Curated annotation (Swiss-Prot), chain C:
Domain notes: Each subunit has two RNA-binding sites, one at the surface of the hexameric ring, and one at the center of the open ring structure, where RNA helicase activity is thought to take place.
Protein name as catalogued: Transcription termination factor Rho
Assembly mode: Homohexamer. The homohexamer assembles into an open ring structure.
Region feature RNA-binding 2, mapped onto this chain: 71-75
UniProt function note: Facilitates transcription termination by a mechanism that involves Rho binding to the nascent RNA, activation of Rho's RNA-dependent ATPase activity, and release of the mRNA from the DNA template. RNA-dependent NTPase which utilizes all four ribonucleoside triphosphates as substrates.
Record family assignment: Belongs to the Rho family.
Residues of the full protein shown: 214 to 419 of 419
Site (RNA-binding 2): 113
Length: 419, 419, 206
């Protein structure tokens, strides 16, 4: 009866539900087709069908209501919306539309929206008066996000080190510089666990580009939030389509005084798809990357803002270096000074089986006074003074043992005061 | 009714004004489109509409009246001027044009200027007899600008150190050598506060290139003047367009016996956009920078002159070094001997949590006799004699404590006379 | 209705043949105009003829002339186009006195082949030319005249020494520009100038 709950059901249960209804031969077909078939048969009974999803607008003028469960993949079960409804209710790409859907008549292959009663988890009339994201005035980050977890007390010190190396706030536009095989994937997973635990109210969204199918499944099971990803076998145009879907959805949520945190992986992979999709302008720069090709990633990355009126958009991205590819090096260079927080990883530290492989000297943040307190800020400065003479590798094992025998960061801070 | 006052109004109030007028669906759209819509509806009433802005001329021959509020960004609300009006009133890029604007007829998407009654804050007939900036004879700086603030008495000694290290006058062409993470941003902000306080009559203009959106907003709130900036996500051509807009506007104001102070950030960033925009000449020099590519920044930087007839143009720029980019090192080398004042910052001093991180020995100025007085000049020479044997790092903490316990620089000067 | 508008607008002698009239009627009126003009030229008078159109005129001439047993490309006989050549070539400047000026229109890209075969033989038979472009008209810019393609022969005799040099300077600037960008560039310059002399002295500034 309800579209959102039907997709969340297991595929094995989905076949059983359709068999007793009256349908046949639903076992050996894609799950998306099964949902369309079940809704089609259930529509004959005359009962109302509820549907919801993320709305996008095509270039022709009509739009479809994509579902975040299938990573915004086009399917027969997508809800079609006429352009006339767009005039009645001001809608743009990214917003969530929920309402009743009518059975598709002959000649059309998609369900049509009948009546909308919920826009962006709010009344449709109220959503019409929302201010657009681009008119909002950005500000520096001021809401400290405690990345350290005390109740878990796990053997991993990544959360404790991350706060000391570079505090993360709401609306940050930081990036992660991670060489290959340096624990980049687990670094994002640990951050996601703390966000889902310390700040359950904040909306957490994870976007992955050119990731293996088994890596996507593990991310969904581990991260307690909305995870959308595109596999490598999918075309480069699919990567562009999903990338714009995530940011547009986040912007609409920010307009409703909500905080959205986006874990991006990766800018280099994202810029790879953007360069291929954009047509050639007749001029090729160094590395085969056009000037206008990297304009799109700049728009996506720069959207991380702290709204003065209310809410914030936090974007955390990963940058790949020393991958053996020049094109990728050029992408990193243009994305150096664009970030508020920086987090540089070192392959050599990972070669010593010491984790997390974080370069404390290279890592840093801007305007850390607003995030931390007066007492906390001074303690961090004292720690950096001791670390700076030490090398990038010797600093980690020095910090790891100190944090290993201390319960919280406060206990570590008062220990350094003794010396 | 008036274009300039309508843009300064908050976006929230802008929607409310258009709702009672008769317009609808103004909430979910860009602020620039709202202004055009409100003016379009108000034009139907027949009331006259006043508009103003900075005039620029395109290559075709027609021009548009850009607004400094939107950082001279192209928009539907820009005022269009026919080439015929250019012959009637000699206008070039940079000048300010104010007058009535007629409603746009069918077939055109921009407002047209009806009658101009104010050119460069002066009668249009008088502006026609102004002499061009290039015909003016430059001279050395002779008007001392007191950068020290006494009433504030803040804990920051940057203003006091700046006067002692290198006095700044009207028409100076100095540059700032600032390594990354050396307090470069706050250095310009402190200078802007003193200029807006000690010399309210002088026009202060701040130009920022490739800066984060949150950094631009903070600069506008802190600096009491005209601030225009271009974000990193904008194309390199946008950076060139705004850079020429600021200097052309300054030159027109100088011709009217006015003093203009420009805070440039940064020459390396500005040269980065200029190199990309200019087409390749078939020859590539070291670092991928063409000889003609850096010609444009030289014209922009060299325009800082002290007019004998009246007025002056002061340009203060920042140079980035040790950013690990040969592209940026080559740019710095050609811009070494092109400054009347130099100010070199040291990263090592900033690592000691001592501010401002200014290399007193490296910093200096030319023709300081004209700026300072006979008595003041001798005191500075005595101080430099003591500082020179000391290192670049030990000199700061030696100077900081002396200035900390003294009220003004005069009290510090008489204290050194004791020894 | 087009003939009636022409008579009201043109202050002179206007004669035309409608489409419903037979092709022989078109031939009869065409010879009437040129023969009348020739007699007036003999009396030391100047006659200017606006022809529209050579392709339409050649269409009637081809049908009227009997077939010679040989058909060329496009169904147009060699002798069929002999008559339009006589009509068009009569434009002469008499040394003794008077002149005959003939201005004609040629139709191209009409989807026919006759209208091309006809245009090709009438290419190099003109003292002056004037090529219009459909693409320029699609931009709502008038007149849709291809400045680069248009030209004239022996323009030294018509214009003066000073005027001729100014035209050469203008053509030098226009030539690098495209056939479409040249018009709007020229239109705005002429729009803000009173006469062509004012436009000419403006280009001298650059
Ligand atoms: N916080 C951590 N603690 C212990 N081991 C880690 C940690 N993070 C990563 N690793 C090690 O890194 C390996 C996986 O690295 P991977 O995520 O593939 O690096 P990358 O993402 O750079 O390719 C695992 O075998 C794991 O043992
Ligand atoms: N005059 C000053 N007094 C105290 N601290 C300063 C001063 N100037 C800069 N800082 C410190 O520098 C940091 C910001 O540096 P930043 O402006 O990012 O350097 P850069 O502009 O070279 O990147 C702040 O955390 C601030 O504490
Ligand atoms: Mg990985
Ligand atoms: Mg800076």
């Amino acid at each position: 009866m309800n579209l959102t709950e039907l997709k969340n059901t297991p595929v094995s249960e989905l076949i059983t539900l359709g068999e007793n209804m009256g349908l046949e031969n639903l076992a050996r077909m894609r799950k998306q087709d099964i949902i369309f078939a079940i809704l089609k048969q259930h529509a004959k009974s005359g009962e109302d069908i509820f549907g919801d999803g993320v709305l996008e607008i095509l270039q022709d003028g009509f739009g479809f209501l994509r579902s975040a469960d299938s990573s915004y993949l086009a399917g027969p079960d997508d809800i079609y919306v006429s352009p006339s409804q767009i005039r009645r209710f001001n809608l743009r790409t990214g917003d969530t539309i929920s309402g009743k859907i009518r059975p598709p008549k002959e000649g059309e292959r998609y369900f049509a929206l009948l009546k909308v009663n919920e826009v962006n988890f709010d009344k449709p009339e109220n959503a019409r008066n929302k201010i657009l994201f681009e008119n909002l005035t950005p500000l520096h980050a001021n809401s400290r996000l405690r990345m350290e977890r005390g109740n878990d007390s796990t053997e991993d010190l990544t959360a404790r080190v991350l706060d000391l190396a570079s505090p993360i706030g709401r609306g940050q536009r930081g990036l992660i510089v991670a060489p290959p095989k340096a624990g980049k994937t687990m670094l994002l997973q640990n951050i996601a666990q703390s966000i889902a635990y310390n700040h359950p109210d904040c909306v957490l969204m994870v976007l992955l580009i050119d990731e293996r199918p088994e890596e996507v499944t593990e991310m969904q099971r581990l991260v307690k939030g909305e995870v959308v990803a595109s596999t490598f076998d999918e075309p480069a145009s699919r990567h562009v389509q999903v990338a714009e879907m995530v940011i547009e959805k986040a912007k609409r949520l920010v307009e409703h005084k909500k905080d959205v945190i986006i874990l991006l992986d990766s800018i280099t992979r994202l810029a790879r798809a953007y360069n291929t999709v954009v047509p050639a302008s007749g001029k090729v720069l160094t590395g085969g990357v056009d000037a206008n090709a990297l304009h799109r990633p700049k728009r996506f990355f720069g959207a991380a803002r702290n709204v003065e009126e209310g809410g914030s958009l936090t974007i955390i991205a990963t940058a790949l270096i020393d991958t053996g590819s020049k094109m990728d090096e050029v992408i990193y260079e243009e994305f150096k000074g664009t970030g508020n927080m920086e987090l540089h990883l070192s392959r050599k530290i990972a070669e010593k089986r010491v984790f997390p492989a974080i370069d404390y000297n290279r890592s840093g943040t801007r305007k850390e006074e607003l995030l931390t307190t007066q007492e906390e800020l001074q303690k961090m400065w004292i720690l950096r003074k001791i670390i700076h003479p030490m090398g990038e590798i010797d600093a980690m094992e020095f910090l790891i043992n100190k944090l290993a025998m201390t319960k919280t960061n406060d206990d570590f801070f008062e220990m350094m005061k003794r010396s």
